[PDB]
Write a protein that binds this DNA or RNA. Structure first.
Ligand SMILES: [Ca+2]
Ligand SMILES: [Ca+2]
Ligand SMILES: [Ca+2]
Length: 223
DNA sequence: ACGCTAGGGATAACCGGGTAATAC
DNA sequence: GTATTACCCGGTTATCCCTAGCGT
């Protein structure tokens, strides 16, 4: 076998890299479980072939989170996160951090769940059959936040920013969250698009499930 | 008198395209 | 010359927080 340190700065078509890639067969349980939450959240899973391999591309303002995800997928990630500096239409500078895994058939398992016929969809019983506490944690860290951002608020209600999904898809996600994790949640409307509202009653239930997996610099998102 | 939420707006992300670097 | 592909880019906007001023 080959150590990552030996390949991480070779060319894309380097034979040693391909030999390093061939040693890896599957995502570990943690990378797959977190992957579910990430693809529900801020993650871009893509194929350049016809579904033979997939990679995940990442972009985040939060560098520490980017770092944490890169460490989680360490064996799949050759490069540190690269700084992305861009200029707005208003003239403002915008900083974010970019990273990607290399492409690999091990990522097909994640893609098969969501990417059917070249389009990001949600399967019927996704939450019920796949979403673990770890998945929920990464989903929250990607899409999660407060319902009440007022200073000195007593409201402990959570929001999951699911605006890219259809109303029907989000309803199914709600049905799952309620049945599997006993969360008192329902669909609400922002910009004529769906979000998931988790009531303040269920705050402790939600927080206890995800606490093992969240990082300090993502705690600001919690009420 | 003030908890709460619909609506605002500049991002913080998603999404594909291009290319520099091996192999043959 | 062609295939290969990880690390960038830049086009876009649905996010992701902030708050007006509604409702009681
Ligand atoms: Ca998202
Ligand atoms: Ca996010
Ligand atoms: Ca988006």
């Amino acid at each position: 076998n080959i150590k990552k340190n030996q390949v991480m700065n070779l060319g894309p078509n380097s034979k040693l890299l391909k030999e390093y890639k061939s040693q890896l067969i599957e995502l570990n349980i943690e990378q797959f479980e977190a992957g579910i939450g990430l693809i529900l959240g801020d993650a871009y899973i893509r194929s350049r072939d016809e579904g033979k391999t997939y990679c995940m591309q990442f972009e985040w303002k939060n560098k520490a989170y980017m770092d944490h995800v890169c460490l989680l997928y360490d064996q799949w990630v050759l490069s540190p996160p690269h700084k992305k500096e861009r200029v707005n239409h208003l003239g403002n500078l915008v900083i974010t951090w970019g990273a990607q895994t290399f492409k690999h058939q091990a990522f097909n398992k994640l893609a098969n769940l969501f990417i059917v016929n070249n389009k990001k969809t949600i399967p019927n019983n996704l939450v019920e059959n796949y979403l673990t506490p770890m998945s929920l944690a990464y989903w929250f860290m990607d899409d999660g936040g407060k319902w009440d951002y007022n200073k000195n608020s007593t409201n402990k209600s959570i929001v999951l920013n699911t605006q890219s999904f259809t109303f029907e898809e989000v309803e199914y996600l709600v049905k799952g969250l309620r049945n599997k994790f006993q969360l008192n949640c329902y669909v609400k409307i922002n910009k004529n698009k769906p979000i998931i509202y988790i009531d303040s009653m269920s705050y402790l239930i939600f927080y206890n499930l995800i606490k093992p997996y969240l990082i300090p610099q993502m705690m600001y998102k919690l009420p």
